[PDB]
């Protein structure tokens, strides 16, 4: 019933608190997304703590893991929402902030938007199930680690394997077909890294010139990014891939 749990701790929908009466300038669009991100951050943290096995890890690791994977978690959840609500035609950031063709253009990050829409499309092509999605999401939280290692390395390794097995369980069907499914689903997981690399590059770029660009970031994000940025630029993080 490990999934029964994943299903119960799955965060409730988060609204952007977006004001459509405002002009959709690049500044307002990005600042609004950053606000949504701050609100989603709170939800991912509360979700992580309720994750069977996450609390067994050292606090330092818990901090490090969320710090390195928050962008991937949110982009992936965005992929799912866009899949269930628009069959992947639009980015369902939040019920009150749906990105259509127009907002993608005025956002100044059209390409990153398409990259994110591509994840949504994969969900469509593969008809990913809700259970597969929940398991994959957890794996994401456990796929970007410090090159030097975690403090609860052993506790970490066990947890990761358990969720990988949980994914297999979600995956009736014959053995070969289940193998092919696993291969394809883990290919999707590995693809997140390139997408995230690009998402993070723009995030760091807008973060550095925040005031000069008039792109706002909520306090919680400012602290996370401020600490994370140098670590990423220093190549301190590495992905845990499923494929060559």
């Amino acid at each position: 019933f490990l999934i029964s749990i994943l299903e119960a701790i799955e965060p409730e929908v988060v609204y952007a608190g977006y004001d459509n009466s405002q002009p959709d300038t690049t500044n307002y669009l990005l600042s609004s997304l950053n606000r949504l991100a701050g609100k989603q951050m709170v939800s991912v943290v509360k979700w992580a703590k309720a994750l069977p096995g996450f609390r067994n890890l050292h606090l330092d690791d818990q901090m490090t893991l969320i710090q390195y994977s928050w962008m991937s978690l949110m982009a992936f959840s965005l992929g799912w929402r866009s899949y269930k609500h628009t069959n992947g035609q639009m980015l369902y950031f939040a019920p009150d902030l749906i990105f259509n063709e127009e907002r993608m253009q005025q956002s100044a990050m059209y390409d990153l938007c398409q990259g994110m829409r591509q994840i949504s499309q994969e969900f469509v092509r593969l008809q990913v199930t809700y259970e597969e999605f929940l398991c994959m999401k957890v794996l994401l939280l456990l796929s970007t680690v410090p090159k030097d290692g975690l403090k609860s390395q052993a506790s970490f390794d066990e947890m990761r394997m358990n969720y990988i097995k949980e994914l297999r369980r979600a995956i009736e069907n014959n053995s070969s077909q289940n193998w092919q499914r696993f291969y394809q689903l883990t290919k999707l997981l590995d693809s997140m890294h390139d997408l995230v690399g690009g998402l993070l590059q723009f995030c760091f770029y807008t973060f550095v010139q925040s005031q000069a660009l008039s792109v706002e970031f909520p306090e919680m994000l400012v602290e996370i990014i401020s600490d994370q940025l140098p670590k990423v630029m220093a190549g301190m993080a590495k992905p845990l891939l499923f494929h060559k």
């Binding site: 943290v45 509360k46 606090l59 901090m63 969320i66 919680m220 602290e223 600490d227 994370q228």
Partner: peptide, 10 residues
């Protein structure tokens, strides 16, 4: 990440 740490340890 002050706000985050405080949120994770409670």
């Amino acid at each position: 990440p002050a706000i985050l740490y405080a949120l994770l340890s409670s």
